[PDB]
Amino acid sequence: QLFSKTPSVTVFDNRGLSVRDIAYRRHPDTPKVTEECITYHQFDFRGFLAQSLDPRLNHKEVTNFSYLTDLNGNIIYTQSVDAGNTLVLNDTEGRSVIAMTNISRNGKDDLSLAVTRTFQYENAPLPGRPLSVTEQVNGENARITEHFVYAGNTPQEKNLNLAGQCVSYYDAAGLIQTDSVSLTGKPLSVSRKLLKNLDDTNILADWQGNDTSAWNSLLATEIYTTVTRTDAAGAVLTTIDAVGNQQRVAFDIAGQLSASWLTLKGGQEQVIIKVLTYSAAGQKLREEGGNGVVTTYTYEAETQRLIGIKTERPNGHAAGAKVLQDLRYEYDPVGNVLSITNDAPENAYRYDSLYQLVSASGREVAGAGQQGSDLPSPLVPLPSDSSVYTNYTRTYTYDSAGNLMRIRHSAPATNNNYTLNITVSERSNRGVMSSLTENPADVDALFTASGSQKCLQQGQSLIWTPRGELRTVLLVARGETADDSESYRYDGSSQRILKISSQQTNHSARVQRALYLPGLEWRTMTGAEAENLQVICIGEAQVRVLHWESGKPDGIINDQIRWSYDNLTCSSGLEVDGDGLVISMEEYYPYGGTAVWAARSHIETAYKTVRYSGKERDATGLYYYGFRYYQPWAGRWLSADPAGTVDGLNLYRMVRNNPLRLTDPDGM
Amino acid sequence: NMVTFFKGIANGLSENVCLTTDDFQRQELEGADWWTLLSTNQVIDDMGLVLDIHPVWGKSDEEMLMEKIQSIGVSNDNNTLSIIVQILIQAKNAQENLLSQTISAEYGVERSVVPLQLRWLGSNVYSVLNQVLNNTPTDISSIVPKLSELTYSLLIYTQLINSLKLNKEFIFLRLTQPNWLGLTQPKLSTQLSLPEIYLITCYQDWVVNANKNEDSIHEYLEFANIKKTEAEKTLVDNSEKCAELLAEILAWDAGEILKAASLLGLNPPQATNVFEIDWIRRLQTLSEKTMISTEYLWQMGDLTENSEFSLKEGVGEAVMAALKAQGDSDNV
Amino acid sequence: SNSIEAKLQEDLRDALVDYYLGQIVPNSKDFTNLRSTIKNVDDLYDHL
């Protein structure tokens, strides 16, 4: 095959370190040229890499990195033209001491933008463990972003197995009072308390001075503790989100999951499974949830390349024999997909020799329009029609370096053809769809000294913060009104513990506040009549469930349970009730634009936000991927992470661009 | 592209750069308006803009702004003068920085050296602002190509300087001291010829290869060049002192160097132009090759000239002496 | 190495040799009658 003679090579100095990258890359439809897909790598007299480049900068003769090091030669203070000069600094004993980034490009660069965090520790006799850390505003005030209050060794602390342990991680978003632990070292309870008002966007969550005798002003009434009991196997015996949600699980003779039963807040606990069958690889095979459908999955047993999946309501079901789907899938030697189809009409794909995707033709639903920063309406009810998902072609294009060019498309069924084109920096990964700016050198002015974007999707309000975190935003609004804005709390582990959005100006004043906790999302859309409702981690990958405290639905029960098809990409593309009828079916390009979006009923729109990639949508259409975030109109991160250096040069390098090249989306 | 330059510069000039009568009738500024005085003794434009003088190592920012007023003295008060210097320096800083921020940094321009980039174009910030107002050409039609030619020559200068990884002091002292270079010509800015380029080469080469700091070299060049030309000629003393200093810089015999100057007929002996040091250095390279008496190394030129034998046999024996002594140093 | 120049002296041998054959043979006021001596080695004995 013409794919032959595309090898990768590595070439070394006499020290024995690879002085360049080598591949042999060909665009298949113009096969005469194989690219100079090779690049510089340079290492010091200590054998440690000083430099590497985009080849496209090499004849431009401008450097891309800096590294600075100690005796023992570890990196200290270091820069790239995308990441910016950045520091984390550590003890002799490697304990962290301080962290800084967001420093300008003249060389006299301005550390008054250092965004500082610094760390504080035990003293003798105690071993020197971190009792605390503080933010410092660069050039300004420090505030104690957390404490890690280590226990003593009282008989109490023995009992609780908290001997010496952090009984109180006073923290961003409040306190977790770790307050019992097992002989198996597993925790057994911890009082997660929020802030005195967690939807207060500006109370510190910083823990200055003597002790919580002060910070009682700052910790919540929301004493939303968790409690736990454990097997000797360490698997969960039970666990209880002390607001009233709880869980139990059981396993086979070896240890695979056999059943689980999960109490929704103060309710009964009920089993999720009706029938179960795994593969011997422990992967699934033939399952029936409380949904009561036969679903089955079929794969290359050597590799679990799923050749297909079938679902029906079985013969003799409460709603009789009814096939619901029958998907089939096709794969290459290394295992890249090439096509998929289903019945109850086909789609197909192409890649560079690099496996860099280039084509993704298929079928997509009429009337959805050309993709914007939106989710359309679903087709409702679910079309039985053979055609409304009309056939189409879509394609991808990419830089010599790790950057996209364009997505290019035809909708011949409707002549709705168009192309998307990206403007990108002369000198960095800074770049966006050309209607934001067409200028590939103006475009680089638009990003922070930490390479996050200065302003939102089309210039809307945004602030980035310590832990790097974006923390307030104006997703969309009228006349610059704040009543359509959004903001977050997260803990020091960046657990996105609370949403607080407004969408209420001349509107239903149901303040779009939602908590997130162990086992729990608590949407609290307060004040029209407050729509206050919990949803629980029925899994994680999850079945899903709902409970109104207020703002009850029409025609719909509280505590209703539904299963969903987190597919080969975890993409939750279909949702089904306890009776084997589909609520909704939806699908999306690799670019994450929707191919299809449909439901059997209309207000079901309100009930589903975790979707493509299996990830949560943020409100506009972009996904909360899970620490970073994904924009589908651009088909990109809307978020840099220069920590991707471990795996690629581009701060916004999305994935190995056939995304199915890789397994598991954490969304950082 | 050019329109976006004129965009920021045309508005910001009128906004902030226009220095005013009240700026020179401030609470401390009693009596005659320094604004008028400098709008008479030309230092401030009728648009209030600073008449930006080119930087040179002969002086400094405040030294220049001080002399600017002290050379005539519309006010004798050191206080008023000094604070007015503070005022005009903040104004000039804003003026110059604004022009730096406005110039398409996308040109690959380091904003920090924009005024000296201008001075290599001969031009200055003030004349830039003058042309900026002459059309406020934030439009494609009013931008005359004479203006864009500057950016073009900047494309040249920048691709060069970006390969150089230049230091501002280099260009500063360069334009300050072409008399220290091999050339001092009217429009080098455009002639941009090989001699200049080789001067750059050997200059940067010496910089990286030298044993000591760049300013220690500038000190050598002051103590040799300016010192020799203090009077018509003035520097018998620093023959040895410069030779030893350069020996510290390059690790070779000061005496040998002095003799090299002697056979070059350079009086006073101090080799003090970049090309002179480079030649000397080439002599050192020849020494690093063969360690022969540079007297003879130079005498070797006559060998090509035949026409006589005694010198030939002499230097021939000299080559044998080199063979034995240096070979022995290569082998023992 | 001195070996480099160590050729020169053989050249000098050749020079002497020719100075014998070329100059001495016709210009020898000594040995003006006697000839033979066609080969270098000869005078190594005869007078050298």
The DSSP secondary structure of A1-70, one letter per residue, reads -TTSS---EEEE-SS--EEEEE-----TTSTT-----EEEEEE-TTS-EEEE--HHHHTTT---EE--B-
Listed residue (A149, A141, A196, A142) closest to A174, CA to CA: A196
Residue C6 Cα, gap to closest chain B Cα (Å): 12
Q: How many Å apart are CA A31 and CA A2, to the nearest integer?
A: 8
B93 touches chain A (CB under 8 A): no
DSSP state of A111: G
- The residue written with tokens 């978003």 in the block is A173
3+ Cβ–Cβ pairs closer than 8 Å linking B and C: yes
Q: How many Å apart are CA A505 and CA A482, to the nearest integer?
A: 9
Do residues A262 and A538 touch, judged by C-beta distance below 8 A? yes
Residue A405 vs residues A32, A114, A208, B6, B18: alpha-carbon distances, Å? 22, 33, 49, 31, 45
Structure tokens at A355: 């496996």
Listed residue (A401, A358, A468) closest to A88, CA to CA: A468
Structure tokens at A654: 């999305």
Do residues B124 and B95 touch, judged by C-beta distance below 8 A? no
Q: Is the dihedral of CA A207, A208, A213, A215 positive or negative?
A: negative
A62 contacts B111? CB cut-off 8 A: no
One-letter amino acid at A60 equals: K
- Smallest Cβ–Cβ distance between A61 and the set B4, B111, B162 belongs to B162
Residue B4 Cα, gap to closest chain A Cα (Å): 10
DSSP-based three-state secondary structure for B103: coil
C1 contacts B327? CB cut-off 8 A: yes
Do residues A589 and A631 touch, judged by C-beta distance below 8 A? no
B331 touches chain C (CB under 8 A): yes
Q: Which residues in chain A touch residue B110, judged by CB atoms under 8 angstroms apart?
A: 106
- The residue written with tokens 């079309």 in the block is A383
- Chains in contact with A, counting 3 or more C-beta pairs less than 8 Å apart as contact: B
Q: How many Å apart are CA A249 and CA C36, to the nearest integer?
A: 125
Q: How many Å apart are CA A345 and CA A330, to the nearest integer?
A: 15
Furthest-apart CA pair in chain C: how many Å? 45
Between B78-102 and B2-12, two packed helices, what is the crossing angle to 10 degrees? 160
Structure tokens at A252: 């086979």
- Chains in contact with B, counting 3 or more C-beta pairs less than 8 Å apart as contact: A, C
CA angle, A3 then A646 then A356, to 5°: 25
Q: Which residues in chain B touch residue C1, judged by CB atoms under 8 angstroms apart?
A: 327, 331
Q: Which residues in chain A touch residue B100, judged by CB atoms under 8 angstroms apart?
A: none
Do residues B137 and B147 touch, judged by C-beta distance below 8 A? yes
B110 touches chain A (CB under 8 A): yes
Q: Which residue of C has its CA nearest to B331?
A: C1
B329 touches chain C (CB under 8 A): no
C-alpha of A285 from chain center: 27
Q: Which residues in chain C touch residue B320, judged by CB atoms under 8 angstroms apart?
A: 5
Between B78-102 and B61-70, two packed helices, what is the crossing angle to 10 degrees? 130
- Residues 6 or more apart whose CB falls under 8 angstroms from that of A261 comprise A247, A248, A249, A269, A270, A271, A272
B111 contacts A441? CB cut-off 8 A: no
Q: Sort A412 into a burial class: Cβ within 10 Å, 0-12 / 13-18 / 19+.
A: exposed
Residue B318 vs residues A422, B304, B312, B324, B326: alpha-carbon distances, Å? 71, 16, 10, 10, 11
Q: Which residues in chain B touch residue C8, judged by CB atoms under 8 angstroms apart?
A: none
**Does a cis peptide bond (omega within 30 degrees of 0) precede residue B268?**
yes
Structure tokens at B323: 């063979």
B104 contacts A61? CB cut-off 8 A: no
Q: How many Å apart are CA A139 and CA A149, to the nearest integer?
A: 28
B267 touches chain A (CB under 8 A): no
Do residues A379 and A604 touch, judged by C-beta distance below 8 A? no
Which of B106, B111, B162, B163 to mutate against chain A (most A CBs within 10 Å)? B106
Pairing of strands A582-588, A431-433: unpaired
B155 touches chain C (CB under 8 A): no
Pairing of strands A286-289, A486-489: unpaired
Buried b / exposed e over A241-257, threshold 16 CB at 10 Å, is bbbebbbbbeeeeeeee
Residue A377 vs residues A47, A72, A411, A619: alpha-carbon distances, Å? 57, 59, 19, 14
Structure tokens at A30: 């113009």
Show the DSSP H helices in A442-528 as ranges.
none
Q: How many CB pairs under 8 A join A and B?
A: 13
Phi/psi region, residue A189 (left: phi>0; alpha: psi -120 to 50; beta: rest), is beta
Between B214-221 and B238-250, two packed helices, what is the crossing angle to 10 degrees? 160
Which of C3, C5, C8 to mutate against chain B (most B CBs within 10 Å)? C5
One-letter amino acid at A45 equals: F
B4 contacts A106? CB cut-off 8 A: no
Structure tokens at A551: 């703002």
Q: Which residue of B has its CA nearest to A444?
A: B106
Q: Is the dihedral of CA B176, B181, B182, B188 positive or negative?
A: negative
- Which helix H or strand E contains A331, and what residues bound it? strand A322-331
A106 contacts B104? CB cut-off 8 A: no
Residue B47 Cα, gap to closest chain A Cα (Å): 30
DSSP state of A284: B
* Resolution value in angstroms: 6.4
- Smallest Cβ–Cβ distance between B110 and the set A61, A106, A441 belongs to A106
DSSP state of B50: B
Listed residue (A55, A5, A6, A59) closest to A649, CA to CA: A55
A426 contacts B162? CB cut-off 8 A: no
DSSP state of A484: G
Q: Is the dihedral of CA C26, C30, C31, C33 positive or negative?
A: positive
- The residue written with tokens 């000294």 in the block is A449
Q: Which residue of B has its CA nearest to A107?
A: B112
Q: Cα dihedral angle (A555, A556, A562, A568), rounded to 10 degrees?
A: 60
Q: What would the DSSP string read from start to end of A68-101?
A: -B-TT--B-SBEETTT-SBEEEE-TT--EEEEE-
C5 contacts B320? CB cut-off 8 A: yes
B303 touches chain C (CB under 8 A): no
Q: Which residues in chain B touch residue A446, judged by CB atoms under 8 angstroms apart?
A: none
- Residues 6 or more apart whose CB falls under 8 angstroms from that of C44 comprise none
CA angle, A606 then A607 then A612, to 5°: 105
- Which helix H or strand E contains A221, and what residues bound it? strand A219-223
3-state secondary structure B152-207: HHHHHHHHHHHHHCCCHHHHHHHHHCHHHCCCCCCCHHHHCCHHHHHHHHHHHHHH
Structure tokens at A79: 């820069």
Which of C2, C3, C7, C8 to mutate against chain B (most B CBs within 10 Å)? C2
Q: What would the DSSP string read from start to end of A150-185?
A: E----HHHHHTT-TTSEEEEEETTEEEEEEEE-TTS
Do residues A356 and A397 touch, judged by C-beta distance below 8 A? no
Q: How many Å apart are CA A300 and CA A433, to the nearest integer?
A: 40
Listed residue (A476, A482, A468, A523) closest to A621, CA to CA: A476
Q: Which residue of B has its CA nearest to A105?
A: B110
- Residues 6 or more apart whose CB falls under 8 angstroms from that of A323 comprise A310, A311, A312, A344
Q: What would the DSSP string read from start to end of A547-601?
A: EESSS--SS--TT-EEEEEE-TT--EEEEE-TTS-EEEEEEE-TT--EEEEEESS
Structure tokens at A272: 């999720």
B4 contacts A441? CB cut-off 8 A: no
DSSP state of B48: -
- The residue written with tokens 């096709």 in the block is A330
B108 touches chain C (CB under 8 A): no
Phi, psi of A617 (to 5 degrees): -70, 135
Q: Which residues in chain C touch residue B323, judged by CB atoms under 8 angstroms apart?
A: 4-5
Phi, psi of B86 (to 5 degrees): -60, -40
C1 contacts B323? CB cut-off 8 A: no
- Residues 6 or more apart whose CB falls under 8 angstroms from that of A124 comprise none
Report the helix count and the strand count for chain B, using DSSP H and E. Answer: 17, 0
Do residues B323 and B291 touch, judged by C-beta distance below 8 A? no
C4 contacts B331? CB cut-off 8 A: no
Do residues B211 and B250 touch, judged by C-beta distance below 8 A? yes
Do residues B40 and B166 touch, judged by C-beta distance below 8 A? no
Residue C15 Cα, gap to closest chain B Cα (Å): 18
Q: How many Å apart are CA B274 and CA B180, to the nearest integer?
A: 7
A61 contacts B106? CB cut-off 8 A: no
Q: How many Å apart are CA A534 and CA A549, to the nearest integer?
A: 8
Q: How many Å apart are CA A629 and CA A623, to the nearest integer?
A: 6
Q: How many Å apart are CA A309 and CA A568, to the nearest integer?
A: 10
3+ Cβ–Cβ pairs closer than 8 Å linking C and A: no
Do residues B114 and B100 touch, judged by C-beta distance below 8 A? yes
Pairing of strands A187-195, A174-181: antiparallel
DSSP state of B40: T
Buried b / exposed e over A181-213, threshold 16 CB at 10 Å, is beeeebbbbbbbbbbbebbeeeebbbbeeeebe
- Chains in contact with C, counting 3 or more C-beta pairs less than 8 Å apart as contact: B
R_g (Cα) of chain C, nearest Å: 13
Do residues A650 and A487 touch, judged by C-beta distance below 8 A? no
Residues of C with CB under 8 A from a CB of B: 1-2, 4-5
Listed residue (B239, B301, B300, B252) closest to B280, CA to CA: B252
CA end-to-end span of chain A: 37
A441 contacts B112? CB cut-off 8 A: no
Structure tokens at B225: 């060049």
Listed residue (A305, A365, A370) closest to A335, CA to CA: A305
Residue B176 Cα, gap to closest chain A Cα (Å): 22
Q: How many Å apart are CA C31 and CA C48, to the nearest integer?
A: 14
- Which helix H or strand E contains C46, and what residues bound it? helix C41-46
Q: How many Å apart are CA A108 and CA A616, to the nearest integer?
A: 42
Q: Where is chain A discontinuous (C–N over 2.5 Å), named by the preceding residue?
A: 105, 344, 527, 540
Pairing of strands A257-263, A245-251: antiparallel
Phi, psi of A176 (to 5 degrees): -110, 105
B162 touches chain A (CB under 8 A): yes
One-letter amino acid at A325 equals: Q
Q: How many Å apart are CA B21 and CA A511, to the nearest integer?
A: 55
CA angle, A622 then A404 then A436, to 5°: 60
